[PDB]
Write an enzyme that holds these catalytic residues in place. Sequence first.
Site, PDB file in Angstrom:
ATOM      1  N   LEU A 167      -5.891   3.021  -2.184  1.00 58.67           N
ATOM      2  CA  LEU A 167      -4.468   3.344  -2.075  1.00 58.67           C
ATOM      3  C   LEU A 167      -4.287   4.683  -2.800  1.00 58.67           C
ATOM      4  O   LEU A 167      -4.992   4.961  -3.767  1.00 58.67           O
ATOM      5  CB  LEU A 167      -3.613   2.261  -2.749  1.00 58.67           C
TER       6      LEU A 167
ATOM      7  N   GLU B 295       3.437  -5.254  -5.939  1.00 61.48           N
ATOM      8  CA  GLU B 295       3.549  -4.791  -4.564  1.00 61.48           C
ATOM      9  C   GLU B 295       2.548  -5.609  -3.743  1.00 61.48           C
ATOM     10  O   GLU B 295       2.848  -6.055  -2.636  1.00 61.48           O
ATOM     11  CB  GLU B 295       3.233  -3.296  -4.484  1.00 61.48           C
TER      12      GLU B 295
HETATM   13  N1  NDP Z   1      -0.703   1.444   1.876  1.00 62.26           N
HETATM   14  C1  NDP Z   1      -0.922   0.579   2.855  1.00 62.26           C
HETATM   15  O1  NDP Z   1       0.001  -0.159   3.242  1.00 62.26           O
HETATM   16  C2  NDP Z   1      -2.281   0.469   3.554  1.00 62.26           C
HETATM   17  C3  NDP Z   1      -3.321   1.327   3.168  1.00 62.26           C
HETATM   18  N2  NDP Z   1      -4.644   1.229   3.926  1.00 62.26           N
HETATM   19  C4  NDP Z   1      -5.615   2.273   3.459  1.00 62.26           C
HETATM   20  O2  NDP Z   1      -5.765   3.208   4.581  1.00 62.26           O
HETATM   21  C5  NDP Z   1      -7.179   3.438   4.822  1.00 62.26           C
HETATM   22  C6  NDP Z   1      -7.795   2.699   6.066  1.00 62.26           C
HETATM   23  O3  NDP Z   1      -6.918   3.174   7.144  1.00 62.26           O
HETATM   24  P1  NDP Z   1      -7.621   3.801   8.441  1.00 62.26           P
HETATM   25  O4  NDP Z   1      -8.452   4.964   8.098  1.00 62.26           O
HETATM   26  O5  NDP Z   1      -6.455   4.160   9.258  1.00 62.26           O
HETATM   27  O6  NDP Z   1      -8.639   2.796   9.116  1.00 62.26           O
HETATM   28  P2  NDP Z   1      -8.483   1.477   9.991  1.00 62.26           P
HETATM   29  O7  NDP Z   1      -8.297   0.323   9.119  1.00 62.26           O
HETATM   30  O8  NDP Z   1      -7.420   1.570  10.987  1.00 62.26           O
HETATM   31  O9  NDP Z   1      -9.880   1.333  10.696  1.00 62.26           O
HETATM   32  C7  NDP Z   1     -10.200   2.354  11.681  1.00 62.26           C
HETATM   33  C8  NDP Z   1     -11.428   1.745  12.361  1.00 62.26           C
HETATM   34  O10 NDP Z   1     -11.112   0.425  12.821  1.00 62.26           O
HETATM   35  C9  NDP Z   1     -11.280   0.137  14.203  1.00 62.26           C
HETATM   36  N3  NDP Z   1      -9.986   0.278  14.897  1.00 62.26           N
HETATM   37  C10 NDP Z   1      -8.714   0.739  14.618  1.00 62.26           C
HETATM   38  N4  NDP Z   1      -7.859   0.535  15.669  1.00 62.26           N
HETATM   39  C11 NDP Z   1      -8.592  -0.094  16.601  1.00 62.26           C
HETATM   40  C12 NDP Z   1      -8.326  -0.605  17.859  1.00 62.26           C
HETATM   41  N5  NDP Z   1      -7.079  -0.491  18.350  1.00 62.26           N
HETATM   42  N6  NDP Z   1      -9.309  -1.224  18.585  1.00 62.26           N
HETATM   43  C13 NDP Z   1     -10.603  -1.389  18.154  1.00 62.26           C
HETATM   44  N7  NDP Z   1     -10.904  -0.902  16.924  1.00 62.26           N
HETATM   45  C14 NDP Z   1      -9.918  -0.256  16.139  1.00 62.26           C
HETATM   46  C15 NDP Z   1     -12.312   1.224  14.569  1.00 62.26           C
HETATM   47  O11 NDP Z   1     -13.648   0.979  14.067  1.00 62.26           O
HETATM   48  P3  NDP Z   1     -14.897   1.195  15.020  1.00 62.26           P
HETATM   49  O12 NDP Z   1     -15.239   2.648  14.885  1.00 62.26           O
HETATM   50  O13 NDP Z   1     -16.073   0.433  14.450  1.00 62.26           O
HETATM   51  O14 NDP Z   1     -14.664   0.879  16.478  1.00 62.26           O
HETATM   52  C16 NDP Z   1     -11.951   2.434  13.652  1.00 62.26           C
HETATM   53  O15 NDP Z   1     -12.952   3.399  13.210  1.00 62.26           O
HETATM   54  C17 NDP Z   1      -7.861   3.060   3.507  1.00 62.26           C
HETATM   55  O16 NDP Z   1      -7.706   4.223   2.635  1.00 62.26           O
HETATM   56  C18 NDP Z   1      -7.012   1.873   2.998  1.00 62.26           C
HETATM   57  O17 NDP Z   1      -7.101   1.756   1.576  1.00 62.26           O
HETATM   58  C19 NDP Z   1      -4.889   0.243   5.030  1.00 62.26           C
HETATM   59  C20 NDP Z   1      -3.894  -0.609   5.387  1.00 62.26           C
HETATM   60  C21 NDP Z   1      -2.548  -0.526   4.680  1.00 62.26           C
HETATM   61  C1  MMV Z   2      -1.013  -4.069  -1.249  1.00 62.72           C
HETATM   62  C2  MMV Z   2      -1.048  -2.778  -0.326  1.00 62.72           C
HETATM   63  C3  MMV Z   2      -0.245  -3.011   0.834  1.00 62.72           C
HETATM   64  N1  MMV Z   2       1.146  -3.108   0.668  1.00 62.72           N
HETATM   65  C4  MMV Z   2       2.010  -3.321   1.703  1.00 62.72           C
HETATM   66  N2  MMV Z   2       3.343  -3.414   1.511  1.00 62.72           N
HETATM   67  N3  MMV Z   2       1.505  -3.444   2.989  1.00 62.72           N
HETATM   68  C5  MMV Z   2       0.189  -3.368   3.257  1.00 62.72           C
HETATM   69  N4  MMV Z   2      -0.264  -3.482   4.465  1.00 62.72           N
HETATM   70  C6  MMV Z   2      -0.751  -3.154   2.201  1.00 62.72           C
HETATM   71  O1  MMV Z   2      -2.089  -3.084   2.550  1.00 62.72           O
HETATM   72  C7  MMV Z   2      -2.796  -4.341   2.382  1.00 62.72           C
HETATM   73  C8  MMV Z   2      -4.197  -4.117   3.049  1.00 62.72           C
HETATM   74  C9  MMV Z   2      -4.972  -2.973   2.298  1.00 62.72           C
HETATM   75  O2  MMV Z   2      -5.153  -3.341   0.876  1.00 62.72           O
HETATM   76  C10 MMV Z   2      -5.808  -2.504  -0.069  1.00 62.72           C
HETATM   77  C11 MMV Z   2      -6.372  -1.173   0.247  1.00 62.72           C
HETATM   78  C12 MMV Z   2      -7.025  -0.382  -0.786  1.00 62.72           C
HETATM   79  C13 MMV Z   2      -7.116  -0.908  -2.097  1.00 62.72           C
HETATM   80  C14 MMV Z   2      -6.567  -2.216  -2.430  1.00 62.72           C
HETATM   81  C15 MMV Z   2      -5.896  -3.053  -1.428  1.00 62.72           C
HETATM   82  C16 MMV Z   2      -5.311  -4.402  -1.736  1.00 62.72           C
HETATM   83  C17 MMV Z   2      -5.381  -5.004  -3.211  1.00 62.72           C
HETATM   84  C18 MMV Z   2      -4.372  -4.457  -4.333  1.00 62.72           C
HETATM   85  O3  MMV Z   2      -3.494  -3.592  -4.049  1.00 62.72           O
HETATM   86  O4  MMV Z   2      -4.558  -4.909  -5.506  1.00 62.72           O
END
Ligand code: NDP
Ligand code: MMV
Length: 186
Positions: free
Chosen positions: A22, A30
Site C-alpha cells: 500500500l 482501514e
Molecule cells: N489500496 C487498495 O485498495 C488496493 C491496493 N492493491 C495494491 O495494488 C497492487 C496490485 O494491483 P495491480 O498491479 O493492479 O495487479 P492485479 O492485482 O490487478 O493483478 C494483475 C495481474 O492479475 C491478472 N489479471 C488482472 N485482471 C485480469 C483479468 N481480467 N483476467 C485475467 N487475469 C487478470 C493478470 O495476471 P496474469 O499475467 O498471470 O494473467 C495480471 O498480470 C499492489 O501494489 C497491491 O498492494 C490491490 C488491491 C486493492
Molecule cells: C486494507 C486495504 C484495502 N482497503 C480497502 N478499503 N479496500 C481494499 N480493496 C483494500 O485492499 C485489500 C486487498 C489488498 O491488501 C493489501 C495490499 C498490500 C499490503 C497489505 C494488504 C492488506 C493487509 C493490511 O492492510 O494490513
Amino acid sequence: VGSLNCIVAVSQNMGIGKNGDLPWPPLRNEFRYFQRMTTTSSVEGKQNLVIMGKKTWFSIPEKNRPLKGRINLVLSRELKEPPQGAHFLSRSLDDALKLTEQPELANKVDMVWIVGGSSVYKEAMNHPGHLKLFVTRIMQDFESDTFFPEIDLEKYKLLPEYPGVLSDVQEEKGIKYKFEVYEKND
Ligand SMILES: NC(=O)C1=CN([C@@H]2O[C@H](COP(=O)(O)OP(=O)(O)OC[C@H]3O[C@@H](n4cnc5c(N)ncnc54)[C@H](OP(=O)(O)O)[C@@H]3O)[C@@H](O)[C@H]2O)C=CC1
Ligand SMILES: CCc1nc(N)nc(N)c1OCCCOc1ccccc1CCC(=O)O
C-alpha cells in the site's frame, strides 16, 4: 448470487499501491473495515466471494491469505491452478462471474466483491449494470505506482449515508481518511 461491488482504498492522487504494497503505512482499522464489509453476508447459509488480480493476491500478507470466511477467486491467464491457499481461478472477469452462476457456487454465493487491482476495477466499473463502489479516501498524497481508474460521477452517485459505514473523518498513524459509497445502475 447477490450484488456486485468494488472496494478500494485510494490516496488523493488516486494511488492504490506501490512495489506490491500500500502507498501508505499499514492502517489497522482501514483493514478491519475492508474485512468487515467484504466478509459480512446478509443471507443466512451463504458466503461472499472476493475476486482479485494475481498481484493483489500476492500482496496480501500470507497470514491473511486466503481472506477468511470468504471464497477467494484469483484472476490470471498464466496460472494453471489457484495459488496455494486460494479457492478458485478464472481467466477473465466474465468467467469469474459465470462461475458464480454454476450449480457449484450458485447456491452458496451472496455478495461478490472485487478487491483489486486496477484492470479488474476498470472493467467492472465500466460494465453496464447495477454496481456499488466502496471507496476509502486516504486524504493525503502518496507516491504510488498503481492507480484507481476514473470514477464517472455522471453515472456513480455518492450516497449521502450508508448503513454500517461511518460518515465522519477517521485518523490512524497521523493519516486522515473517510469512507464513501457510490452507486450506479445502467
Ligand atoms: N489500496 C487498495 O485498495 C488496493 C491496493 N492493491 C495494491 O495494488 C497492487 C496490485 O494491483 P495491480 O498491479 O493492479 O495487479 P492485479 O492485482 O490487478 O493483478 C494483475 C495481474 O492479475 C491478472 N489479471 C488482472 N485482471 C485480469 C483479468 N481480467 N483476467 C485475467 N487475469 C487478470 C493478470 O495476471 P496474469 O499475467 O498471470 O494473467 C495480471 O498480470 C499492489 O501494489 C497491491 O498492494 C490491490 C488491491 C486493492
Ligand atoms: C486494507 C486495504 C484495502 N482497503 C480497502 N478499503 N479496500 C481494499 N480493496 C483494500 O485492499 C485489500 C486487498 C489488498 O491488501 C493489501 C495490499 C498490500 C499490503 C497489505 C494488504 C492488506 C493487509 C493490511 O492492510 O494490513
